């Protein structure tokens, strides 16, 4: 749910 | 893992192709500088650079072989070091200046416009000077930047399996070392000069760590002083450093 | 003007560094357990103070160091002192997985680290470094090289030509030791890189440690030597 | 004036 986590996915 | 199946030429090409672009600042040269606005410019730029950095990281051989949580940790640890090495690289041909962007060159005097900033400027300028002294090559720079991504958090990572995750990183690191030596050998350096230059280059990573540590404390104080709002990404990055 | 350091062979460099090694010191013989935050920090800062005195005398014996001006010697030590203490601690602890051998009679684990606010995080980093060195089979001859590299390198950018030549001589010496130990060329440069990359982590630990020391100064519970206070102040932290 | 000076010079 971290922003970094999401961007690393998306 | 194709990452470990790359020749030195192929590793260099992969890294060169992965390079993010040089961004412009929204710098309005008519607006008189305040501490709030200069930090406004810098944090805005950092936030935009961070997005490209995340996508660049995905393209560094070996990186996406890691679990997502491991990728998050490595970027959390390394982000400011990676910004800084990039700034120093951009600034190399501008003695006494830091080229945050082509439209935003600042010298140490402008650094004093923000409390606690001038000391950090001086360290960055000294690094740029060192890069110039060594005649650092673009191919060497992209290797070092990928070394930072993979190395900086490798010792601050659960189970015996989480350890295998660390082993892959070390193998990729060794490949990049092989690549650096390959570049130097191609540049006509003797064996002795290759080992010496490799050391010189890797020792600068210690200074980059130091600058990043100091910068992180600076950012924390800016957050506490609350004179420039911080992007949510930047806040979470800072938060990861506790 | 010319430094004797640059004229040394690899064996002479290795021998000079081994001979220069400071002794392993003891902590207090009081067996009172467990510790308090005040008493643990008391023992650690007392030990740091005593090791520092030996460090300053060790540095004077690192080839090329006394060729610098007094002021450059001061700068280098002020910048590197905690890194140098830490690499020494990590080296001493290498044969004790899971423990930090501060002294032969003060061998602590991470749980004991929790006795001090903000300390367990640092213990964990040191323990990781110790484990890494153990897994790389770090040799004493390599260790003394790395330690001298820290002394010369850490402050050099915040000033250099003499220093960089001496650093080069130490790289030559490290490579000498690895070839001597039977490593191929590719293994030598890979190992050289592996060792130097650990120095980045040591810098990180030192920086976290310096913030910890500052907070301890501010909490004003644990007496700190004038020397320790001056080494801390140098970091304007 | 620093303890460090004294130690380096002693
Ligand atoms: C001068 C330094 C201050 C760090 C502390 C600051 O408090 C952190 C936030 C400012 C970041 C500025 C910055 C932006 C960028 O795109 C690349 C960079 O290397 C830097 C940077 O090095 O900022
Ligand atoms: C665990 C670490 C905490 C540093 C922060 C502390 O706040 C610094 C003061 C305590 C120093 C302890 C110490 C003593 C010594 O002889 C060798 C060492 O490596 C250390 C040391 O690493 O202290």
| Overall SS class of chain A | mainly alpha
CATH class of chain B: Mainly Alpha
At the fold tier of CATH, the topology name of chain B is Retinoid X Receptor
Secondary-structure element series of chain A: H
- Strand coverage percent of chain A: under 5%
The oligomeric status of these chains comes to heterotetramer
Helix-strand pattern of chain B: HHHEEHHHHHH
Portion of residues in helices of chain A?
over 70%
**What is the CATH superfamily classification of chain B?**
Retinoid X Receptor
Describe the main β-sheet of chain A briefly.
none
Query: Helical proportion of chain B?
Result: 55-70%
Give every kind of bound small molecule, once each. alpha-zearalanol
Determine the structural class of chain B based on helices, strands and strand pairing.
mainly alpha
Instruction: Note the total helix count of chain A.
Output: 1
Rg on CA atoms of chain B, Å: 18 Å
Number of strands of chain A: 0
Please state the overall shape of chain B, judged from the principal axes of the Cα atoms.
globular
N-end to C-end Cα span of chain A: 12 Å
Structure in words:
The complex is a heterotetramer, with two copies of chain A (10 residues), one copy of chain B (242 residues) and one copy of chain C (237 residues). Chain A is an all-alpha fold and 10 residues long. In chain A, 70% of the residues lie in helices and 0% in strands. Chain A has one helix spanning 3-9. Chain A is elongated, with a radius of gyration of 5 Å. The relative contact order of chain A is 0.36. Chain B is mostly helical and 242 residues long. Chain B has nine helices and two strands; from the N terminus they run αααββαααααα. Chain B has a two-stranded antiparallel sheet with strand order 1-2. Chain B has helices at residues 8-18, 35-57, 68-90, 108-111, 118-134, 138-151, 162-186, 191-225, 232-240; strands spanning 98-101, 104-106. Chain C has 237 residues and is mainly alpha-helical. Chain C has helices spanning 10-20, 37-59, 70-92, 110-113, 120-135, 140-153, 161-180, 185-219, 226-233; strands at 99-103, 106-109. In chain C, strands 1-2 form a two-stranded antiparallel ribbon. In chain C, β1 and β2 form a beta hairpin. In chain C, α5 (120-135) runs antiparallel to α8. Chain C is globular, with a radius of gyration of 18 Å. Bound molecules: alpha-zearalanol (2 copies). One alpha-zearalanol is lined by residues 42-43, 45-46, 49, 83-84, 87, 100, 120, 124, 215, 218-219, 222 of chain B. Chains A, D: Belongs to the SRC/p160 nuclear receptor coactivator family. Chains A, D: It is found in: Nucleus. Chains A, D: A motif (LXXLL motif 4) lies at residues 4-8. Chains A, D: This is Nuclear receptor coactivator 1.
């Amino acid at each position: 749910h971290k922003i970094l986590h999401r961007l690393l996915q998306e | 893992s194709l990452a470990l199946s790359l020749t030195a030429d192929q590793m260099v090409s992969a890294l060169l192709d992965a390079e993010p672009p040089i961004l412009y600042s929204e710098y309005d040269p008519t607006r008189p500088f305040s501490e709030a606005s200069m930090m406004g410019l810098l944090t805005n730029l950092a936030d935009r650079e961070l997005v490209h950095m995340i996508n660049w990281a995905k393209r560094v051989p070996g990186f996406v072989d890691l679990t997502l949580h491991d990728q998050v940790h490595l970027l959390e640890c390394a982000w400011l070091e990676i910004l800084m090495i990039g700034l120093v690289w951009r600034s190399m041909e501008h003695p006494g200046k830091l080229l945050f962007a082509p439209n935003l060159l600042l010298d140490r005097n402008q650094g004093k416009c923000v409390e606690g900033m001038v000391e950090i400027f001086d360290m960055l300028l000294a690094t740029s000077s060192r890069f110039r002294m060594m005649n650092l090559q673009g191919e060497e720079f992209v290797c070092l930047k990928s070394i930072i991504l993979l190395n900086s958090g490798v010792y601050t990572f659960s189970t015996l399996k989480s350890l295998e995750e660390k082993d892959h990183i070390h193998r990729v690191l060794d490949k990049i070392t092989d690549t650096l030596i390959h570049l130097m050998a191609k540049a006509g350096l003797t064996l002795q000069q290759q080992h010496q230059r490799l050391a010189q280059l890797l020792l600068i990573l210690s200074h980059i760590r130091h600058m990043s540590n100091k910068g992180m404390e600076h950012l924390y104080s800016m957050k506490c002083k609350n004179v420039v709002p911080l992007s949510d990404l930047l806040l979470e990055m800072l938060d990861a450093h506790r």
